[PDB]
């Protein structure tokens, strides 16, 4: 994870890079935060009367 | 002449958006690594 050179390197298990393109890994977007929605807390029934 | 060239991820296809689920294809070894290289194959020979 040092640096994408090195990435290369542990994709192809070799510790010489021969010059070319090289596809090392797929890049993934994590989420930031969870989010929640949920139907309206109405239409209940009534236990505090 | 030229094929569609499609690089399908053996990580998201195989384990949607999961980690532990991504610990059991670990299990299998290079399974996902080798039909990674045989997709880049075919769209390298695509190419030529």
Same mark, same amino acid.
Not at chain 1, 1 to 8: F, K, M, V, W
Not at chain 1, 23 to 33: A, Y
Not at chain 1, 40 to 45: D, G, P
Not at chain 2, 29 to 38: E, P, Y
């Given at each position: 994870?040092?640096?994408?050179?090195?990435?290369?390197?542990?994709?192809?298990?070799?510790?010489?890079?021969?010059?070319?393109?090289?596809?090392?890994?797929?890049?993934?977007?994590?989420?930031?935060?969870?989010?929640?929605?949920?139907?309206?807390?109405?239409?209940?029934?009534?236990?505090?009367? | 002449?030229?094929? !569609?060239?499609? #690089?399908?991820?053996?990580?998201? @296809?195989?384990?949607?958006?999961? !980690?532990?689920? #991504?610990?059991?294809?670990?299990? @299998?070894?290079?399974?996902?690594?080798?039909?990674?290289?045989?997709?880049?194959?075919?769209?390298?020979?695509?190419?030529?």
């Amino acid at each position: 994870a040092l640096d994408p050179l090195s990435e290369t390197k542990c994709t192809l298990k070799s510790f010489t890079v021969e010059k070319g393109i090289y596809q090392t890994s797929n890049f993934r977007v994590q989420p930031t935060e969870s989010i929640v929605r949920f139907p309206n807390i109405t239409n209940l029934c009534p236990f505090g009367e | 002449v030229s094929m !569609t060239k499609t #690089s399908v991820d053996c990580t998201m @296809y195989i384990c949607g958006d999961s !980690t532990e689920c #991504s610990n059991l294809l670990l299990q @299998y070894g290079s399974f996902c690594t080798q039909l990674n290289r045989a997709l880049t194959g075919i769209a390298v020979e695509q190419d030529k």
